C-alpha cells in the first residue's frame, strides 16, 4: 500500500508540474521564493532539534545493538560485562557530540528585528544551522549504528577468546572516526554564521 | 544487521555462547585417550557438558545413556532458545522441529504394524518432534483414518498433498514412501519460508544448508531404492525434493537410476558431490560436508541460521561422543579417530 | 438429505418387545405404526421374525452376544470385499449389489421371505455352533475369492511381459516372431548372430560402419528383422571371438546390443510362455466372475442370519420376557434415512431407560469429525433400543 | 458475507445444525449493507429539497 502512495504522489507531482508548465505558469512552482519567504527560525530551530534528535536516535540504536548481544554473550562468559562497556561508551559519545553542537547552535538564536528579518545574514544563518544540524545528526546516527554493529561483533568475539577484543576494538575506533568528523564539519559550516539580528 | 538485535539480540549471543562449547580437535583427542566410560564422563565434565551424567554413578553407565543425556541437554538448550523467540524467529524454530515430527510420525506408525507396545515405541521417539496427538497415531492402520482423525490439527497437515491412499492400509514399504514424501513437501515449504520471510544474510547461507539436506535426502532415496525397492521412476520422482543444488538436471537421472552406476554417473556431473560415491564411507562424506557448511554459517554474524548451524553441529558432537564412547566400551579402537571435527 | 447419496434401498433392523407401545403415537400397536405412521406412510415393512433355538443358559447368553457382534463384523468385511471386486472389474453392474436380487428375487422382497432360511442351518442346532458354522463358511468363500483374484493379477503381469517380447521396445524384447533361417544361423561351428538395436536416425551410420566395426563380420548381413517405433533391429552374422569386440565397439557409437543368439528351443519356449499367460488369464477371469456371484448370494444369506439371530439374542438379554420378540425389518426409501432414525428414537427410546437416552442426533459421512454415529460399542454414545442400521 | 459464508459452508457439511446459525450470522452481515442503503436513500431524498 505504501508503494501505491509513492506512485500516487509521484503521479500527482508530475500532473501538477506538467499542468503548471503547459499553461505558461511554470515559474509559479517557485522553490527560491519559498526559501526567501519562509522564516529563518524554522530552519534554525529545526536544525538544532534534528541535530540533538538524530544524534540520540543513533546513540540509542547502537546502545541496544551492542547491549543485547553483550548480555546474550555474557551468559556463559560473564567476564565481558564490564570490560566491554567501552562499546556502549563509543556509541554513546555520538549523543554528546550532537548535544554540544546543538547548544553552540542555540547560542546563535536571538530575536531579529522585523525591518531586517529576511536579510542576507539572517537567512544565511538559518540555512547554515539547518544543514549543519542535519549533517551532524545524520552523521552521528550513522556512526552510532556502525559502532553498535562493530561492538555487537566485538561482544561475541570477546566471549569467544579474550585476545580478540583488543583486535576488534580497532574497528570500533575506525567506526567512531565518523561522528567526530561530523562534529568537525558541523562546526565549520556554522562557523561564519552570525546571530539573528 | 541493523534490525537484527531487536528480537534476536539475546537469542544469538547465547547461541554464540553455545557454539563455544563445541568440542575442538584437542578436546576430541583427550576423549580418545580414555580407558573407561567413567574416565570419559570425567573428561567430559571439564567441558561445557559438566555434570550432566551426575545422577548415574558409574554402575548403570552405558554408551546409550551418554547418547541419551548428551542429546537431552541439546534438546533442553534448544527449548530454552525457542522459548525466548518471537515472531519470525519462533516460526523458524517451529519449522526446524517439523522435520523431527515427520520422523516421529513415521516411527510411531511402524510400531503399530508390528504390534509393538505403545509405551516403548515412544521412548525411541524424538523429543523435539513432539506434538500433542503423537501417541494417538496408534489408533488406526490406514493413511486416511490417521490423517482425517489425528494429522489434520497437526502442522504436518499441508504436507499430505501427494500421499495417494489407494485403500491399502499399511505395510513397511509405503510408510517409507509417506515419510519421504512428507519430508519432500516439508523441504519445499521450509525453503519457501526461508526465501520469503528470513532476512538476507540468514537467507543465502540457510538456502545452502537446506538445499544440502535436500541433496543428501535425494541421494539417499535414489540409492536405497536399488536394494529394497522396485518402483517406477514416475513414482520415484515424487520422493525427490526440488529446492536443492541437485534438482533440475541430476534428480532426473537419479529418478531413472536403475543401477549403482546410474547414480554414480548422475552425481559425477555435479561438482561438489562428485567423489563421494567413489571411496570411503558415504555417510561420513555427507556429515563432513554438513559440518563444513555449518562452520561457515557461524562466520556470518547477524544471522538466524546460526541456530541451525549450532544444533546440527551439536548433534554431530553428540554423534562423535557416542562413537567414541562406543569405541572405548566395546574395546575396539581401530577407528576411534573416525569423528568429524571442524571446530 | 445431501450429506449422503442413496439410490438403492436402505434397511434398519429393529426388534422390540411385543408388549411395546410408541409414545410418538400413543394408541397404536408397533406393527400398525410401521406401516401407517412411519416416514409419511412410505415405509415398506417386511417380516423378519425368527423363533427360539436352544439356549445354553443365561450364562451362555452373554458369551453368544459377544461373538455375534464380532462374526457380524467379519462377515460384513467379506461381503464388502466380494462386491468391491465385482464392481472393480466393471463386467457386472456397479449400480447394483445394494438392491441386486438374491435367489433371483428383489432384496426388500428377499428379506420378506426371510424367516430363517435353510441351506445347512436348522432351528434344532445349538446357537453356539450356528455362530461358528456361519463364520467358517463366510471366511472360506472370501479366501477363495482373494486367491483367484491374486492369481488373476500374477497372470496380468505375465501377459504384459510376454507381449513386450512379441512387439514392444528393445530393452527386453526377445525375438520369436521372426523365425527365419536367412536372418539367423544355426548348426554353425564358426558363426553366430548378434542383434543390434539401433536408433532410427543412426540406421544409416550402422549400415556403413558395421563390417569394419568389428573384424571378421559376414557382409551383407544387415536386414531389418524387426522394427518398433524408436529402434530398428538388425541381424549381423560374425565370429564367436569377435562378438565381444562388436558389443563393446557398438556401445561407443550409441547403438544398444540386444544379447540374443539363435537356438530353436528358446524360440519355441518364448512363444509357449506368451500362449500360457493368455490362456491362464482368460480362464481366471470367467472363473472369477462366476465364483464371486455364487459366493455373494451364500454370504448374503449367512450375514442376515447373524443379524436376525443377534437382534433376537440382544433382545432376550436386555428385555428378558416376552420369550418371543417382535422383529421387523424396514426397507427405507433413499434420503429418508435421517427422518426414520429420528422417529424410532423418539417413539421407542423410553423403553430402554432415561440413562440410556443421549442426544447426538444427526449424521456426518465426511471425515471432519467422528461424533454423531450410533453404535453400542463406543462409550461416546449408545443406541437406546435394539436398532441396527444396515447400509448395502 | 464472503468470510462467514466460506467458514459456514465448509463446516455445515460436517454439522447439519450449523446451517441455521450460518443464515443467522449472514442476516447480521447483510443488514450492514441494508444500513448503507438506508443512509443512501435518506441522503438522496434530500439532494434536491430546498435548492436554488
From Swiss-Prot, chain A:
Cytoplasmic side: 20-45, 106-128, 189-197
Role: Proton-conducting pore forming subunit of the V0 complex of vacuolar(H+)-ATPase (V-ATPase), a multisubunit enzyme composed of a peripheral complex (V1) that hydrolyzes ATP and a membrane integral complex (V0) that translocates protons. V-ATPase is responsible for acidifying and maintaining the pH of intracellular compartments.
Outcome following mutation: residue 92 to D: Partial inactivation
Membrane topology summary: Multi-pass membrane protein
Gene Ontology molecular functions: P-type proton-exporting transporter activity; proton-transporting ATPase activity, rotational mechanism
InterPro entries listed in its UniProt record: ATPase_proteolipid_c-like_dom, ATPase_proteolipid_csu, F/V-ATP_Csub_sf
Protein name, UniProt field: V-type proton ATPase subunit c''
UniProt cross-references to Pfam families, sorted A to Z: ATP-synt_C
Superkingdom as given in the UniProt entry: Eukaryota
Main location: membrane
UniProt site (Essential for proton translocation): 92
Listed SUPFAM superfamilies: F1F0 ATP synthase subunit C (SSF81333)
Transmembrane segments: 1-19, 46-66, 85-105, 129-149, 168-188
Subcellular location: Vacuole membrane
Regions of this protein lying in the Vacuolar compartment: 67-84, 150-167
GO CC terms of this entry: fungal-type vacuole membrane; Golgi membrane; membrane; proton-transporting V-type ATPase complex; vacuolar proton-transporting V-type ATPase complex; vacuolar proton-transporting V-type ATPase, V0 domain
Homology family: Belongs to the V-ATPase proteolipid subunit family.
UniProt-listed GO biological process terms: endosomal lumen acidification; Golgi lumen acidification; proton transmembrane transport; vacuolar acidification
Presence of keyword Transmembrane helix: yes
Entry keyword set: Hydrogen ion transport, Ion transport, Membrane, Transmembrane, Transmembrane helix, Transport, Vacuole
UniProtKB/Swiss-Prot annotation, chain B:
One GO term of the biological process aspect: Golgi lumen acidification
Single annotated GO MF: proton-transporting ATPase activity, rotational mechanism
Keyword Membrane: yes
Keywords from the named record: Acetylation, Hydrogen ion transport, Ion transport, Membrane, Transport, Vacuole
GO terms under cellular component: fungal-type vacuole membrane; Golgi membrane; proton-transporting V-type ATPase complex; vacuolar proton-transporting V-type ATPase complex; vacuolar proton-transporting V-type ATPase, V0 domain
Membrane topology: Peripheral membrane protein
Pfam families in UniProt: vATP-synt_AC39 (PF01992)
Bilayer-spanning residue ranges: none
Protein family: Belongs to the V-ATPase V0D/AC39 subunit family.
Reported function: Subunit of the V0 complex of vacuolar(H+)-ATPase (V-ATPase), a multisubunit enzyme composed of a peripheral complex (V1) that hydrolyzes ATP and a membrane integral complex (V0) that translocates protons. V-ATPase is responsible for acidifying and maintaining the pH of intracellular compartments. This subunit is a non-integral membrane component of the membrane pore domain and is required for proper assembly of the V0 sector. Might be involved in the regulated assembly of V1 subunits onto the membrane sector or alternatively may prevent the passage of protons through V0 pores.
Listed name of the protein: V-type proton ATPase subunit d
Curated annotation (Swiss-Prot), chain C:
Cellular localisation: Vacuole membrane
Protein name: V-type proton ATPase subunit C
Lineage of the organism: Eukaryota, Fungi, Dikarya, Ascomycota, Saccharomycotina
Listed Pfam families: V-ATPase_C
UniProt similarity note: Belongs to the V-ATPase C subunit family.
Described purpose of this protein according to its UniProt entry: Subunit of the V1 complex of vacuolar(H+)-ATPase (V-ATPase), a multisubunit enzyme composed of a peripheral complex (V1) that hydrolyzes ATP and a membrane integral complex (V0) that translocates protons. V-ATPase is responsible for acidifying and maintaining the pH of intracellular compartments. Subunit C is necessary for the assembly of the catalytic sector of the enzyme and is likely to have a specific function in its catalytic activity. Reversibly leaves the enzyme after glucose depletion, causing the catalytic subcomplex V1 to detach from the V0 section.
Note: Present with 21114 molecules/cell in log phase SD medium.
GO CC field: fungal-type vacuole membrane; Golgi membrane; proton-transporting V-type ATPase complex; vacuolar proton-transporting V-type ATPase complex; vacuolar proton-transporting V-type ATPase, V1 domain
Organism in which the protein naturally occurs: Saccharomyces cerevisiae (strain ATCC 204508 / S288c)
Gene Ontology molecular functions: ATP binding; proton-transporting ATPase activity, rotational mechanism
Principal location class: membrane
Modified residues (N-acetylalanine): 2
UniProtKB/Swiss-Prot annotation, chain D:
Consequence the record notes for mutating residue 30 to D: Partial inactivation
Subunit description: V-ATPase is a heteromultimeric enzyme composed of a peripheral catalytic V1 complex (components A to H) attached to an integral membrane V0 proton pore complex (components: a, c, c', c'', d, e, f and VOA1). The decameric c-ring forms the proton-conducting pore, and is composed of eight proteolipid subunits c, one subunit c' and one subunit c''.
Keyword annotations of the record: Hydrogen ion transport, Ion transport, Membrane, Transmembrane, Transmembrane helix, Transport, Vacuole
Vacuolar side: 44-52
Transmembrane segments: 18-43
Stretch forming the signal peptide: none
Marked site (Essential for proton translocation) residue numbers: 30
GO cellular component terms given for this protein: fungal-type vacuole membrane; Golgi membrane; membrane; proton-transporting V-type ATPase complex; vacuolar proton-transporting V-type ATPase complex; vacuolar proton-transporting V-type ATPase, V0 domain
Keyword flag 4Fe-4S: no
Protein name according to UniProt: V-type proton ATPase subunit c
MF term (GO), any: proton-transporting ATPase activity, rotational mechanism
GO process annotations (BP): endocytosis; endosomal lumen acidification; Golgi lumen acidification; intracellular copper ion homeostasis; intracellular iron ion homeostasis; protein targeting to vacuole; proton transmembrane transport; vacuolar acidification
Record's miscellaneous remark: Present with 8450 molecules/cell in log phase SD medium.
Family that this chain belongs to: Belongs to the V-ATPase proteolipid subunit family.
Gene this protein is translated from: VMA3
Organism the protein comes from: Saccharomyces cerevisiae (strain ATCC 204508 / S288c)
Subcellular location: Vacuole membrane
Keyword Cell inner membrane applies: no
Cytoplasmic membrane side: 6-17
Amino acid at each position: 500500500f505504501s508503494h501505491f502512495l509513492y506512485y500516487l504522489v509521484l503521479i500527482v507531482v508530475i500532473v501538477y508540474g506538467l499542468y503548471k508548465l503547459f499553461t505558461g505558469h511554470g515559474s509559479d512552482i517557485n522553490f527560491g521564493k519559498f526559501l526567501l519567504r519562509t522564516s529563518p527560525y524554522m530552519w534554525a530551530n529545526l536544525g538544532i532539534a534534528l541535530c540533538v534528535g538524530l544524534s540520540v536516535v543513533g546513540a540509542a540504536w547502537g546502545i541496544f545493538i551492542t547491549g543485547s548481544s553483550m548480555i546474550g554473550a555474557g551468559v556463559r562468559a560473564p567476564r565481558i560485562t564490564t570490560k566491554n562497556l567501552i562499546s556502549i561508551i563509543f556509541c554513546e559519545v555520538v549523543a554528546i557530540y550532537g548535544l554540544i553542537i546543538a547548544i553552540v547552535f542555540s547560542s546563535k538564536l536571538t530575536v531579529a528585528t522585523a525591518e531586517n528579518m529576511y536579510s542576507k545574514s539572517n537567512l544565511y544563518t538559518g540555512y547554515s544551522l539547518f544543514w549543519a544540524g542535519i549533517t551532524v545528526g545524520a552523521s552521528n546516527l550513522i556512526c552510532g549504528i556502525a559502532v553498535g554493529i562493530t561492538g555487537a561483533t566485538a561482544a561475541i568475539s570477546d566471549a569467544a577468546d579474550s585476545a580478540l577484543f583488543v583486535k576488534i576494538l580497532v574497528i570500533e575506533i575506525f567506526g567512531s572516526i565518523l561522528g567526530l568528523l561530523g562534529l568537525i564539519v558541523g562546526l565549520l559550516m556554522a562557523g561564519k554564521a552570525s546571530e539573528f539580528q | 544487521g541493523v534490525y537484527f538485535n531487536i528480537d534476536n539480540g539475546f537469542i544469538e549471543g547465547v547461541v554464540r555462547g553455545y557454539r563455544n562449547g563445541l568440542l575442538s580437535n584437542n578436546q576430541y583427542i583427550n576423549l580418545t585417550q580414555c580407558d573407561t566410560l567413567e574416565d570419559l564422563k570425567l573428561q567430559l565434565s571439564s567441558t561445557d557438558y559438566g555434570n550432566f551424567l551426575s545422577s548415574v554413578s558409574s554402575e548403570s553407565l552405558t554408551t546409550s545413556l551418554i547418547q541419551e543425556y548428551a542429546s537431552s541437554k541439546l534438546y533442553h538448550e534448544f527449548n530454552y532458545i525457542r522459548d525466548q523467540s518471537s515472531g519470525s524467529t519462533r516460526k523458524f524454530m517451529d519449522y526446524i522441529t517439523y522435520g523431527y515430527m515427520i520422523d516421529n510420525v513415521a516411527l510411531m506408525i511402524t510400531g503399530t504394524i508390528h504390534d509393538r507396545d505403545k509405551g516403548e515405541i515412544l521412548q525411541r521417539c524424538h523429543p523435539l518432534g513432539w506434538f500433542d496427538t503423537l501417541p494417538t497415531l496408534s489408533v488406526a492402520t490406514d493413511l486416511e483414518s490417521l490423517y482425517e482423525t489425528v494429522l489434520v490439527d497437526t502442522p504436518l497437515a499441508p504436507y499430505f498433498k501427494n500421499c495417494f491412499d489407494t485403500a491399502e492400509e499399511l505395510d513397511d514399504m509405503n510408510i517409507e514412501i509417506i515419510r519421504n514424501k512428507l519430508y519432500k513437501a516439508y523441504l519445499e515449504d521450509f525453503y519457501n519460508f526461508v526465501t520469503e520471510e528470513i532476512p538476507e544474510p540468514a537467507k543465502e547461507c540457510m538456502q545452502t544448508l537446506l538445499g544440502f539436506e535436500a541433496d543428501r535426502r535425494s541421494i539417499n532415496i535414489a540409492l536405497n531404492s536399488l536394494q529394497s525397492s522396485d518402483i517406477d521412476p514416475d513414482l520415484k520422482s515424487d520422493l525427490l525434493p526440488n529446492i536443492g543444488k541437485l534438482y533440475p538436471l541430476a534428480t532426473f537421472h537419479l529418478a531413472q537410476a536403475q543401477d549403482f552406476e546410474g547414480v554414480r554417473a548422475a552425481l559425477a556431473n555435479v561438482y561438489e558431490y562428485r567423489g563421494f560415491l567413489e571411496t570411503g564411507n558415504l555417510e561420513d562424506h555427507f556429515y563432513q560436508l554438513e559440518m563444513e557448511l555449518c562452520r561457515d554459517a557461524f562466520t556470518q554474524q547477524f544471522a538466524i541460521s546460526t541456530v541451525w548451524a549450532w544444533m546440527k553441529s551439536k548433534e554431530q558432537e553428540v554423534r562423535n561422543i557416542t562413537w567414541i564412547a562406543e569405541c572405548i566400551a566395546q574395546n575396539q579402537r581401530e577407528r576411534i579417530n573416525n569423528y568429524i571435527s571442524v571446530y | 438429505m445431501a450429506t449422503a447419496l442413496y439410490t438403492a434401498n436402505d434397511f434398519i433392523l429393529i426388534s422390540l418387545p411385543q408388549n411395546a407401545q410408541p409414545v410418538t403415537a400413543p394408541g397404536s400397536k408397533t406393527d400398525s405404526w410401521f406401516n401407517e405412521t412411519l416416514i409419511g406412510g412410505r415405509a415398506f415393512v417386511s417380516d423378519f421374525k425368527i423363533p427360539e433355538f436352544k439356549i445354553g443358559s443365561l450364562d451362555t447368553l452373554i458369551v453368544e452376544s459377544e461373538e455375534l457382534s464380532k462374526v457380524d463384523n467379519q462377515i460384513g468385511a467379506s461381503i464388502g470385499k466380494i462386491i468391491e471386486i465385482l464392481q472393480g472389474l466393471n463386467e457386472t453392474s456397479t449400480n447394483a449389489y445394494r438392491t441386486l436380487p438374491i435367489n433371483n428375487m428383489p432384496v426388500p422382497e428377499y428379506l420378506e421371505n426371510f424367516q430363517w432360511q435353510t441351506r445347512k442351518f436348522k432351528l434344532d442346532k445349538s446357537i453356539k455352533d450356528l455362530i461358528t458354522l456361519i463364520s467358517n463358511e463366510s471366511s472360506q468363500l472370501d479366501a477363495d475369492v482373494r486367491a483367484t483374484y491374486a492369481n488373476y493379477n500374477s497372470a496380468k503381469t505375465n501377459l504384459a511381459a510376454a507381449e513386450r517380447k512379441k512387439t514392444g521396445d528393445l530393452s527386453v524384447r526377445s525375438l520369436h516372431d521372426i523365425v527365419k533361417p536367412e536372418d539367423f544361423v544355426l548348426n554353425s561351428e564358426h558363426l553366430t548372430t548378434v542383434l543390434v538395436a539401433v536408433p532410427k536416425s543412426l540406421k544409416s551410420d550402422f549400415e556403413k560402419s558395421y563390417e569394419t566395426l568389428s573384424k571378421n563380420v559376414v557382409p551383407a548381413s544387415a536386414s531389418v528383422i524387426a522394427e518398433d517405433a524408436e529402434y530398428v533391429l538388425f541381424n549381423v552374422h560374425l565370429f564367436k571371438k569377435n562378438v565381444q569386440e562388436f558389443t563393446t565397439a557398438a556401445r561407443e557409437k550409441k547403438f544398444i546390443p540386444r544379447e540374443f543368439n539363435y537356438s530353436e528351443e528358446l524360440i519355441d519356449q518364448l512363444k509357449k510362455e506368451h500362449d500360457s499367460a493368455a490362456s491362464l488369464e482368460q480362464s481366471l477371469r470367467v472363473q472369477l466372475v462366476r465364483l464371486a456371484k455364487t459366493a455373494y448370494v451364500d454370504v448374503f444369506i449367512n450375514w442376515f442370519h447373524i443379524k436376525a439371530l443377534r437382534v433376537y439374542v440382544e433382545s432376550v438379554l436386555r428385555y428378558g420376557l416376552p420369550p418371543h420378540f417382535n422383529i421387523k425389518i424396514i426397507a427405507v426409501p433413499p434420503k429418508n434415512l435421517s427422518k426414520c432414525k429420528s422417529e424410532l428414537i423418539d417413539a421407542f427410546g423410553f423403553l430402554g431407560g432415561n440413562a440410556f437416552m443421549k442426544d447426538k442426533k444427526g449424521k456426518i459421512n465426511k471425515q471432519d469429525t467422528s461424533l454423531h454415529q450410533y453404535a453400542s460399542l463406543v462409550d461416546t454414545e449408545y443406541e437406546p433400543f435394539v436398532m441396527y442400521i444396515i447400509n448395502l | 458475507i464472503g468470510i462467514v459464508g466460506d467458514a459456514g459452508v465448509r463446516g455445515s457439511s460436517q454439522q447439519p445444525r450449523l446451517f441455521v446459525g450460518m443464515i443467522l450470522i449472514l442476516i447480521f452481515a447483510e443488514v450492514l449493507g441494508l444500513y448503507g442503503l438506508i443512509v443512501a436513500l435518506l441522503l438522496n431524498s434530500r439532494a434536491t429539497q430546498d435548492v436554488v
